[model samples]
Target: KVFGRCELAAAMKRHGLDNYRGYSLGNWVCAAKFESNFNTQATNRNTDGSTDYGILQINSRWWCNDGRTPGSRNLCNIPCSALLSSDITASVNCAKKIVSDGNGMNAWVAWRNRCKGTDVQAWIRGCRL
Candidate 1:
């Protein structure tokens, strides 16, 4: 599911992610752009052979299971496919758990590479509250 920026922003705010757990909405939006371009069905295989899923590019090695992804711990205890839906509640829940695990926004390599220390205000530009 590829969402419009404003649509995604509204949904993120509705899910309590506007600034949940001290992370900035800009950071979240910026990360999503770099990760999967807001596509729910996005999937990528890393150099380590782990697959990243959904908008957040969450890794199968520690989060969800892609079934074919070898040695997944499924720490989020949800199917990897669950994250790839128009309803992002499951993805948001898993993301919260990921941040809670001491990684914060650092969990996404795209976040670290592109969003870190960068001005990300454009991510939510023109989005309605």
Candidate 2:
């Protein structure tokens, strides 16, 4: 499922992620833009051979089962595809866990490389929330 940037920003706010884990909603929004383009179905093969999942690009190596990857802890305990739902609850919940686990948004390389310390207002511009 694909989401408009405004819709995604609203959802993130509703999920209490506006400043979740000390990261701004801008960080999340911008990361999603670079990581998955707000497309839930987004998936990618990493150089290390694990797959990234969903809008936040959670990794299979530590987060979910991609079937092809071995020895995943499945810490989120949900199938990687579950993150592809139009309803983002599962993915958000899993992301919450990731942040709580101390990785924060650093778990997503896109966040560290592009969203972090960058002017992120453009990601949330025009959103009523």
Candidate 3:
């Protein structure tokens, strides 16, 4: 019940990002929890007081640009509604792809670096997911 797959899947569907393969959604949820703690509107403080925005804690300075950086990707391309879609997996996957540049699930790897060995499933994928 704490981390239900069905609920995650439903959230993913609502976000219209249900185009992933096996375990992708699960991996993404785990990453979001590690990064922004699932706070879709979370913002990290910047020295300039502009602040990073959204679940991934994107920086406003870079994100507010015209798709010039990762922050902008979430700000311009991925809307809050889309990010918080019914399908949590889609949202997770979107973040993963962006963080890793569509590489080998770097977001999951980052989560494991700090939270690995703390839980049973956390050890999966060489503790990198």
In every candidate, how many clashes are there?
0, 0, 14
**TM-scores for every predicted model:** 0.93, 0.92, 0.45
User: Residue 5 of model 1: what lDDT?
Assistant: 80
Give the alpha carbon lDDT tens digit for every residue of 41-127 in model 1: 998988888888898888899999778777669999998989999898988999999988887888888899999999877888888
The candidate maximizing TM-score is 1
Candidate 1 regions exceeding 4 Å error are none
Q: Candidate 2: deviation at residue 10, Å? A: 0.5
Sort the predicted structures by TM-score, highest score first: 1, 2, 3
**Candidate 3 residue-wise lDDT, 13-126, digit = tens:** 455433344334445455556666666644455565555444544444433432333333343445444443333443454454455444444434545675443452442333
Model 2, range 6-115, lDDT digits (tens) per residue? 99999999998888877788888898889998999898898888988788888899889878887767999989999888888888889999888877778778889998
Looking at candidate 1, the ten consecutive residues that score lowest on lDDT are: 63-72
Candidate 2: misplaced stretches above 4 Å?
Answer: none
The candidate with the higher lDDT, 1 or 3, is: 1
Model 2 misses residue 124 by how many Å?
Answer: 1.1
lDDT of each: 0.87, 0.87, 0.45
